[PDB]
Design a protein around this ligand. Structure first.
Ligand SMILES: [K+]
Ligand SMILES: [K+]
Ligand SMILES: [K+]
Ligand SMILES: [Mn+2]
Ligand SMILES: [Mn+2]
Ligand SMILES: [Mn+2]
Ligand SMILES: [Mn+2]
Length: 136
RNA sequence: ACAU
DNA sequence: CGATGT
């Protein structure tokens, strides 16, 4: 209904899908970039959206912040809730890095706690999430 | 269909 | 146009 401006917004960016994946987190209120992940040579949109949320959880927990996280990814929100990233990406040598990061993110979820609300950014009403890469 |  | 996902 109403945007919660006191929040962290996250998003993936890619060159190809599957392709080069990165992500970033921004202050929803100001657009200030709070974190950015070095590009990963091969991954999927959904793996990156998932890594972005989990990194957000870790970032806010480390800083003792109760802000919610916005994501535009129905898929990634569900994967975080399930603590399981149900990606179809083949596991092979060239996908090893993204899969290691995904496996490590799931492992973190399974060994830590958080109350952070993970909210759907309503693109149809509000436009692109503030962490968007501007590539579409 | 909806979400990327 | 095509890919990733529920
Ligand atoms: K979008
Ligand atoms: K984009
Ligand atoms: K589809
Ligand atoms: Mn997105
Ligand atoms: Mn796993
Ligand atoms: Mn985007
Ligand atoms: Mn388009």
């Amino acid at each position: 209904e109403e945007i919660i401006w006191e929040s962290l917004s996250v998003d993936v960016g890619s060159q190809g899908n599957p392709g080069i994946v990165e992500y970033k987190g921004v202050d929803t209120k100001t657009g200030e970039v709070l974190f950015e992940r070095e590009p990963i040579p091969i991954g999927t949109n959904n793996m990156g959206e998932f890594l972005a949320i989990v990194h957000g959880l870790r970032y806010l927990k480390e800083r003792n912040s109760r802000k919610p996280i916005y994501s535009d990814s129905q898929t990634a929100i569900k994967w975080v809730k399930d603590k399981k990233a149900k990606s179809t990406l083949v596991r092979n040598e060239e996908t090893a890095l993204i899969w290691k990061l995904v496996d490590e993110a799931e492992e973190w979820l399974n060994t830590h706690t958080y109350e952070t609300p993970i909210l759907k950014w309503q693109t149809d009403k509000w436009g692109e999430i503030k962490a968007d890469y501007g590539r579409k």
